[PDB]
Amino acid sequence: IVGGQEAPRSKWPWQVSLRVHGPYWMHFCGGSLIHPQWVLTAAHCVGPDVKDLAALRVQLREQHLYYQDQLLPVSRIIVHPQFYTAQIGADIALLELEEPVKVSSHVHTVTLPPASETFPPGMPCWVTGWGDVDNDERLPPPFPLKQVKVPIMENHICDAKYHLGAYTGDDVRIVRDDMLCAGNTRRDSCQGDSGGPLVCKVNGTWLQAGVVSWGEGCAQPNRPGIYTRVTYYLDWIHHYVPK
Amino acid sequence: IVGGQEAPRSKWPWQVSLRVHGPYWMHFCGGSLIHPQWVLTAAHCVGPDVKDLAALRVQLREQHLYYQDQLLPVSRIIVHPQFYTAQIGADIALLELEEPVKVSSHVHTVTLPPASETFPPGMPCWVTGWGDVDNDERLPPPFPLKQVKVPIMENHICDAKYHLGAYTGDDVRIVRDDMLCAGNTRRDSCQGDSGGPLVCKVNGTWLQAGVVSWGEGCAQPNRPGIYTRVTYYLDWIHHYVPK
Amino acid sequence: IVGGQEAPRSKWPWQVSLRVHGPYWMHFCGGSLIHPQWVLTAAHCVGPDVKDLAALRVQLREQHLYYQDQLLPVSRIIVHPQFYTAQIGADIALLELEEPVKVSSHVHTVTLPPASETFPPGMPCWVTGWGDVDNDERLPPPFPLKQVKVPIMENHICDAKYHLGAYTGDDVRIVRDDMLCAGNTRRDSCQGDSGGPLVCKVNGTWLQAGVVSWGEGCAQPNRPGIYTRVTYYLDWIHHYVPK
Amino acid sequence: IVGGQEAPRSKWPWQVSLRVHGPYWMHFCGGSLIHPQWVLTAAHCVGPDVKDLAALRVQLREQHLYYQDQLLPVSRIIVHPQFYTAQIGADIALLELEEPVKVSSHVHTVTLPPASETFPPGMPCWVTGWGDVDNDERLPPPFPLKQVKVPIMENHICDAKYHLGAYTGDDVRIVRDDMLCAGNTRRDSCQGDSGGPLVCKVNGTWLQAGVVSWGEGCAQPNRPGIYTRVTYYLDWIHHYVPK
Ligand SMILES: *[C@@](O)(c1noc(Cc2ccc(OCCc3ccc(Cl)c(Cl)c3)cc2)n1)[C@H](CCCCN)NC(=O)c1ccc(F)cc1
Ligand SMILES: *[C@@](O)(c1noc(Cc2ccc(OCCc3ccc(Cl)c(Cl)c3)cc2)n1)[C@H](CCCCN)NC(=O)c1ccc(F)cc1
Ligand SMILES: *[C@@](O)(c1noc(Cc2ccc(OCCc3ccc(Cl)c(Cl)c3)cc2)n1)[C@H](CCCCN)NC(=O)c1ccc(F)cc1
Ligand SMILES: *[C@@](O)(c1noc(Cc2ccc(OCCc3ccc(Cl)c(Cl)c3)cc2)n1)[C@H](CCCCN)NC(=O)c1ccc(F)cc1
């Protein structure tokens, strides 16, 4: 996370850390608990190539990475079949846990938005994770969960910005309709925030608008953060995850 | 180049090295001389973001990088306007030299194929360059120009291979119609060969079939090298380069 | 620590972590609390070149580095004036804290040996710290304090081992009389344990025999860990530290 | 080499490159040809631990590293038996080639100084090699042999400078009597120049005064370059090398 602050312990009870087997169980991406048995993440965290499920675990909400790990094994990785790269789109995946988790006020699911919600500019939205605090700058120990409030911008505005300082023709769409844009040169997600949630408070409910997907660096001029637009993939999610 | 050998001095008179300003004029990509004043390369070498022409030079055929440099300034970079990433496609660009080169038997142009030419599967073609000799393995000093014979593979077969061990749906195209495929787990192009030529000898003439574009690593199982299909972009090339 | 285990919370109440100012207060060396206002460490941690006291802090015993830091400022660095390199010797230094520590069962001082004490070969001693777990292998998060039992070895035997597979003449001393030797190819101290204590239980009391100094890598054949011999420098320590 | 310039082809016919077996025969130290069968270098380049001779070769003078290699195998490595570290001293070694080389005006031996020559300040002296051009700054391709004129300073002056900004007591000698000091903040040897020659022209003959040994970084304030003093080790050299 670029800008923002350490999250209060009572905020973001759906935040998860994805861990890869190595010298230790290392954080490589975020996710969100959308069901006691299901984690929502980015496809680019777990694909497009098929990996050994034994090499993956999930960690539920931790204030500080690694200090109190209780790792959960995964039974299934489901990756959107249209996914190949984040810039092409369909950057969305599901992890099925081997067992349902016990939910509480400290650890519980995020609400998915209804199909009609567009998340226009001036919506209050937050992105959370344990990623880099700037381009090529690691989150230092003790690895506190960060949050930052990011301004939403309309896709067409964001598309026009991505074309400034580029050879790409103005008519060749960069920011696609299954994507959502937020952030500026002080407030963004960064490497290690991938797969984590962008959440907006709508009529007193926290809704997941986005999955951290991609950008040209982090907090760079005319290069806002890009997110998988959750409303676009509700029917695909609801094929796997009970309502 | 993976699984290659050092090129004879008399072969590949069209090979060029692209150089970026730093502590020295470092090789970052290949190219081909298609006209005395024009170099053909990959868009991803020089875009999609706009670069300073002052930081770029061209070096014509060298047996060993850096030994006998005579660096040429570039007057214009023309990146295909449909280019954003190599996986989306249109991975092709033109460098206009500030002066035409005086051609010789040692340094001269490659022939572009006719629009009709379909380089059939199995045909023996060659790819050349000063790139890595394996995944994350640098070409050692003294940096000899390398060559490897790579068989052409039909797009449908190559697309099918990229789907093996992948979550991507079989009906979702990975290798697109403006791309061409060559190589196996012993013979491939690699990082630093980007923008360089894939050449095939047809009716006793060397024709440039491909521009080194992308792949999943180098010489990996079921991940052949992907190239920009030159026949696809002949009308765009001929818009700038005299016939 | 090589071949160790995580320390019980009740053990090694004198262990300290030395911290340098940067993007965070990073652990670079160990130390021991020998008096409420004094830390014993290696000269090579803090010399021979003069450093800014503002850039140094001390952290008293913590089970996991960085998690619950309470960083203590240092009023003075005293590096033995005969120190230039660890292999020459006098690898010993004192940090004077700005305030005396309030001692407890969890955090308190280690006992210095009497001048006469000869820690005989084969005696069970312990070395502790947050250093590497093998050659160029970092302690993973969450950075637990580690411990390993290492047998004391006679200087003459240790000197003889350093000469095996070396050009150095057998009559040319490598392990000097102000040094002490411990460890084998399964059990050693390593990079980041420097300045930490080697403690031995004598007549029911923990005595500090050694300060982690140097070696040829960690746990290498015929290259035991070398330590500053504390008994050798008692008169220098007691010049500054009340008895 | 810090400061100075590329050496003319006609200068330093005694300069040698030491090569270690890896992905390529990589330069790690310099040397000097003192006899058709013998190379003079630093002990720290080849010791104190015994290595496999098959992993070492010698390259005689080349203007550009790697471009025209004709590598020579070594029959013997002879390291001063008093050597353990450069700062302790006796930083001197001999390589015996398997065959005598053919000498010419382009490749020939350097003259050793007579026992009485002290090399006082104001002597014109040069140091040569393919080492770093500044602290952690590699010689760029094409790796030209560099030279720099370095001012000699008296041992006592150099010893006093090494004490400025240090804890080491003023009467604890750092610069030892078997060592020689040259350089300033514009002109020095650096990492990769180790084992190479410091040569001074005395009564129209080039004499090797020094072997590149050590320093605190390169061209740093109050830290001139330190060399093994060749006159100190003449009797040891003459045990092995014919006059
Ligand atoms: C994401 O934070 C991000 N950062 O890096 C990535 C890519 C990445 C890196 C490592 C891994 O490790 C997977 C290991 C593994 C092993 C075994 C098993 Cl079984 C499994 Cl499942 C996994 C995966 C993925 N993603 C950032 C966010 C940027 C936000 C900018 N505002 N995204 C990118 O860096 C990025 C992604 C894709 C792009 F096309 C461009 C940029
Ligand atoms: C290509 O060999 C390759 N290798 O690296 C690249 C990417 C790359 C990296 C650096 C640069 O630097 C140019 C910077 C610069 C600065 C100043 C100025 Cl003025 C200019 Cl013009 C430019 C450019 C490009 N490409 C390989 C080939 C793989 C072959 C496999 N068989 N391709 C990739 O590595 C690759 C490219 C694109 C992708 F989407 C994936 C993979
Ligand atoms: C020690 O564990 C060790 N590990 O690294 C060292 C060297 C070292 C590296 C960095 C620093 O940082 C000091 C920075 C600093 C900045 C500001 C301020 Cl204000 C201050 Cl005071 C300081 C210090 C020291 N030492 C190991 C133990 C090996 C045990 C093997 N059995 N020792 C070595 O690595 C070693 C030391 C000396 C040698 F000559 C050789 C080897
Ligand atoms: C020297 O230029 C220098 N630079 O690095 C060294 C140390 C060094 C590095 C690599 C190797 O390779 C060993 C490979 C090998 C493999 C097989 C076989 Cl068979 C053999 Cl024989 C060898 C060896 C040694 N030395 C610089 C010069 C500094 C000049 C400052 N004005 N010296 C140092 O960096 C240095 C040496 C010793 C010190 F105590 C401090 C500094």
Ligand 1 pocket, mutate which of A2, A15, A19, A44 (most atoms under 8 A from CB): A44
Task: Please tell me what DSSP assigns to residue C141.
Answer: T
Q: Is B192 in the pocket of ligand 2 (CB under 6 A)?
A: yes
Question: The tokens of B43 are what?
Answer: 């868009």
Q: Is D130 in the pocket of ligand 4 (CB under 6 A)?
A: no
Q: Which residues are within 8 A (CB) of A55 and not within 5 positions of it... i.e. 6 or more apart?
A: A20, A21
Ligand 4 pocket, mutate which of D58, D194, D220 (most atoms under 8 A from CB): D194
> Which is it for the CA torsion D183, D185, D186, D189, positive or negative?
positive
* Chain C, chain D: beta-carbon pairs less than 8 Å apart: 69
User: What are the start-end ranges of the H helices in chain C?
Assistant: 43-46, 155-163, 234-240
Annotated catalytic residues of C are 44, 91, 194
Range A133-152 burial, b when 16+ CB lie within 10 A, else e: beeeeebebbbbbbbbebeb
Identify the closest residue of chain D to B63 by CA–CA distance.
D67
Domain tally, chain C: 2
Range C46-69 burial, b when 16+ CB lie within 10 A, else e: bbbeeeebeebbbbbbbbbbbbeb
CB A125 within 8 A of CB A200: yes
Q: Is B193 in the pocket of ligand 2 (CB under 6 A)?
A: yes
Question: The tokens of B71 are what?
Answer: 């660096």
CB D94 within 8 A of CB D112: no
Give the span between the Cα atoms of B210 and B179, in whole angstroms: 8
Task: Please tell me what DSSP assigns to residue B161.
Answer: H
Neighbours of B18 (CB within 10 A): 25
Q: Which residues are within 8 A (CB) of D166 and not within 5 positions of it... i.e. 6 or more apart?
A: C47, C48, C49, C50, C84, D174
* CATH, residue A175: 2.40.10.10
> Which residue bears the tokens 């790579």?
B150
Give the span between the Cα atoms of A58 and A69, in whole angstroms: 10
Which secondary structure element, helix H or strand E, spans residue A227, and what is its range?
strand A225-229
First to last CA, chain D: 31
Q: What angle is formed at CA A101 by the lines to CA A100 and CA A104, rounded to 5 degrees? A: 140
Separation of CA C3 from chain center: 17
Which ligand sits closest to the CA of A88? 1
Task: Please tell me what DSSP assigns to residue C205.
Answer: E
Q: What angle is formed at CA C158 by the lines to CA C156 and CA C159, rounded to 5 degrees? A: 65
Pairing of strands C26-35, B225-229: unpaired
Q: What is the DSSP string of C33-50?
A: EEETTEEEE-HHHH-SB-
CB D119 within 8 A of CB D217: no
Separation of CA D130 from chain center: 11
Where do the DSSP E strands lie in A36-150? 38-41, 56-59, 72-79, 93-97, 125-129, 146-149
The tally of CA atoms less than 13 A away on the side-chain side of residue B176 is 14
Q: Which residues are within 8 A (CB) of B130 and not within 5 positions of it... i.e. 6 or more apart?
A: B17, B27, B30, B65, B139, B143, B145, B146, B192, B193
Chains D and C touch (3+ CB pairs under 8 A): yes
Q: How far is CA C58 from CA A114, C100, D222, in A?
A: 53, 12, 30
Verify whether residue A239 is a known catalytic residue. Answer: no
Question: The tokens of D2 are what?
Answer: 């810090």
Ligand 2 pocket, mutate which of B17, B44, B76, B213 (most atoms under 8 A from CB): B44
How many angstroms is it from B214 CA to the middle of ligand 4?
40
Q: Which residues are within 8 A (CB) of D53 and not within 5 positions of it... i.e. 6 or more apart?
A: D73, D74, D75, D76, D77
Contact (CB<8Å) C82/D172: yes
Give the span between the Cα atoms of D97 and A21, in whole angstroms: 50
> Which is it for the CA torsion D191, D192, D195, D201, positive or negative?
negative
Cis before residue B48, ω within 30 degrees of 0?
yes
User: What are the start-end ranges of the H helices in C74-230?
Assistant: 155-163
Give the span between the Cα atoms of C125 and C152, in whole angstroms: 7
Cis before residue C121, ω within 30 degrees of 0?
no
Which residues of chain C are within 8 Å of residue A69 when distances are taken between CB atoms? 142
Contact (CB<8Å) B85/A87: yes
**Domain shared by B71 and B138, yes or no:** no
Contact (CB<8Å) C140/A23: yes
Contact (CB<8Å) C66/A142: yes
The one-letter amino acid code at A113 reads P
Q: Using alpha carbons, select from D140, D17, D30, D139 the residue that is nearest to residue B65.
A: D140
Which secondary structure element, helix H or strand E, spans residue D163, and what is its range?
helix D155-163
> Which residue bears the tokens 């992308």?
B214
Q: How far is CA B233 from CA A5, A203, B56, B80, C236, in A?
A: 50, 52, 24, 9, 80
CB A147 within 8 A of CB A7: yes
Q: What is the DSSP string of A127-143?
A: EEES--SBTTBPPPTT-
Question: The tokens of C41 are what?
Answer: 């460490």
Closest partner CB to D84 (pick from C79, C81, C174): C174
Q: Is A79 in the pocket of ligand 1 (CB under 6 A)?
A: no
User: Following CA atoms C200, C206, C208, C210 in sequence, which dihedral angle do they give, to the nearest 10 degrees?
Assistant: 20
**Domain shared by A169 and A189, yes or no:** yes
> Which residue bears the tokens 């050879």?
A167
CB D80 within 8 A of CB D68: no
**Domain shared by A146 and A52, yes or no:** no
**Domain shared by B3 and B86, yes or no:** no
Give the span between the Cα atoms of C101 and C104, in whole angstroms: 9
**Domain shared by A210 and A123, yes or no:** yes
* Given the residues D17, D32, D189, D194, the one annotated as active site: D194
Which secondary structure element, helix H or strand E, spans residue D31, and what is its range?
strand D26-35
- For ligand 1, what atom is nearest to the CA of residue B85? 39
Where do the DSSP E strands lie in chain C? 5-6, 15-20, 26-35, 38-41, 56-59, 72-79, 93-97, 124-129, 146-153, 179-182, 197-202, 205-214, 225-229
Radius of gyration, CA atoms only, chain B: 17
Picking from B66, B135, B137, B145 by the largest number of D CB atoms within 10 A of its own CB, the best residue to mutate is B66
CB D13 within 8 A of CB D106: yes
Contact (CB<8Å) D24/B67: no
Give the span between the Cα atoms of A227 and A212, in whole angstroms: 5
CB C93 within 8 A of CB C117: no
Contact (CB<8Å) A140/C67: no
- For ligand 1, what atom is nearest to the CA of residue A53? 19
Q: In what order do the strands lie in the sheet with A125-129?
A: A5-6, A146-149, A125-129, A197-202, A205-214, A225-229, A179-182, A152-153
**Domain shared by D82 and D196, yes or no:** no
How many angstroms is it from B46 CA to the middle of ligand 2?
8
Q: Is C94 exposed, middle or buried (0-12, 13-18, 19+ CB in 10 A)?
A: buried
* Given the residues D35, D44, D159, D188, the one annotated as active site: D44
Separation of CA C126 from chain center: 11
Length of chain B: 243
Q: Using alpha carbons, select from A152, A201, A141 the residue that is nearest to residue A11.
A: A201
Q: Where does ligand 3 bind, in terms of residues with CB under 6 Å?
A: C 20, 28-29, 44-46, 51-52, 55-56, 85-87, 131, 188-194, 212, 214-215, 218, 225
User: Following CA atoms C207, C92, C128, C35 in sequence, which dihedral angle do they give, to the nearest 10 degrees?
Assistant: 50
CB C37 within 8 A of CB C97: yes
Q: What is the DSSP string of A20-43?
A: E-SSS-EEEEEEEEEETTEEEE-G
Question: Which residues on chain A place their C-beta less than 8 Å from a C-beta of chain C?
Answer: 23-24, 64-67, 69, 137-138, 140-143
List residues bridging with A147 in a β-sheet: A5, A128
Q: Is A46 in the pocket of ligand 1 (CB under 6 A)?
A: yes
Where do the DSSP E strands lie in D91-224? 93-97, 124-129, 146-153, 179-182, 197-202, 205-214
Which ligand sits closest to the CA of D88? 4
Closest partner CB to D169 (pick from C81, C166, C169): C81
- For ligand 3, what atom is nearest to the CA of residue C91? 37
Q: Using alpha carbons, select from A160, A161, A140 the residue that is nearest to residue A220.
A: A161
Neighbours of C104 (CB within 10 A): 10
> Which residue bears the tokens 């005694």?
D14
> Which is it for the CA torsion C38, C40, C45, C47, positive or negative?
positive
**Domain shared by A5 and A63, yes or no:** no
Which residues of chain A are within 8 Å of residue B169 when distances are taken between CB atoms? 81-82
CB C94 within 8 A of CB C241: yes
Which residues span the domain enclosing C171? 1-12+110-231
Q: Which residues are within 8 A (CB) of B67 and not within 5 positions of it... i.e. 6 or more apart?
A: B142, D64, D67, D142
Partner chains of D (3+ C-beta pairs under 8 Å) = B, C
Contact (CB<8Å) C48/D168: yes
First to last CA, chain A: 31
User: What are the start-end ranges of the H helices in C92-241?
Assistant: 155-163, 234-240
Contact (CB<8Å) C24/A65: no
Question: The tokens of C37 are what?
Answer: 């206002």
Give the span between the Cα atoms of A189 and D32, in whole angstroms: 56
Which secondary structure element, helix H or strand E, spans residue D76, and what is its range?
strand D72-79
Closest partner CB to C24 (pick from A66, A67, A140): A140
Q: Which residues are within 8 A (CB) of D131 and not within 5 positions of it... i.e. 6 or more apart?
A: D1, D30, D139, D146, D189, D190, D191, D192, D193, D194, D196, D212
Q: Is D218 in the pocket of ligand 4 (CB under 6 A)?
A: yes
Contact (CB<8Å) B67/D142: yes
CB B93 within 8 A of CB B47: yes
Radius of gyration, CA atoms only, chain A: 17
Separation of CA B209 from chain center: 10
Chains B and D touch (3+ CB pairs under 8 A): yes
CB D197 within 8 A of CB D30: yes
* Given the residues A27, A32, A91, A132, the one annotated as active site: A91
Q: What angle is formed at CA C11 by the lines to CA C6 and CA C13, rounded to 5 degrees? A: 120
**Technique that determined the structure:** X-ray
Q: How far is CA B74 from CA B24, B30, B37, B66, in A?
A: 17, 15, 9, 18
Task: Please tell me what DSSP assigns to residue D223.
Answer: B
**Domain shared by C114 and C214, yes or no:** yes
Chains A and D touch (3+ CB pairs under 8 A): no
C146: alpha, beta or left? (left if phi > 0; alpha if psi -120 to 50):
beta
**Domain shared by D216 and D236, yes or no:** no
Where do the DSSP E strands lie in chain B? 5-6, 15-20, 26-35, 38-41, 56-59, 72-79, 93-97, 124-129, 146-153, 179-182, 197-202, 205-214, 225-229
Q: Is B49 in the pocket of ligand 2 (CB under 6 A)?
A: no
- For ligand 4, what atom is nearest to the CA of residue D91? 37
**Domain shared by A2 and A122, yes or no:** yes
**Domain shared by B60 and B134, yes or no:** no
Which ligand sits closest to the CA of D214? 4
Task: Please tell me what DSSP assigns to residue C133.
Answer: S
Give the span between the Cα atoms of B233 and D56, in whole angstroms: 52
Q: Which residues are within 8 A (CB) of C238 and not within 5 positions of it... i.e. 6 or more apart?
A: none
Give the span between the Cα atoms of C203 and A56, in whole angstroms: 50
Give the span between the Cα atoms of A176 and A162, in whole angstroms: 11
Q: Is A89 in the pocket of ligand 1 (CB under 6 A)?
A: no
Give the span between the Cα atoms of D96 and D236, in whole angstroms: 15
- For ligand 4, what atom is nearest to the CA of residue D183? 31
How many angstroms is it from D44 CA to the middle of ligand 4?
6
CB C229 within 8 A of CB C178: yes
Separation of CA C127 from chain center: 8
CB A38 within 8 A of CB A95: yes
List residues bridging with C231 in a β-sheet: none
Ligand 3 pocket, mutate which of C76, C87, C95, C191 (most atoms under 8 A from CB): C191
Q: How far is CA A73 from CA A93, A103, A197, D187, in A?
A: 16, 17, 21, 60
Cis before residue C221, ω within 30 degrees of 0?
no
Q: Which residue's alpha carbon is at the smallest distance from atom 36 of ligand 3?
A: C214
Chains A and C touch (3+ CB pairs under 8 A): yes
Mapping DSSP to helix (H, G, I), strand (E, B) and coil, where does residue C160 land? helix
Give the span between the Cα atoms of B40 and B52, in whole angstroms: 18
CB D85 within 8 A of CB C44: no
Give the span between the Cα atoms of D108 and D106, in whole angstroms: 7
Question: The tokens of D156 are what?
Answer: 């006592």
**Domain shared by B120 and B26, yes or no:** no
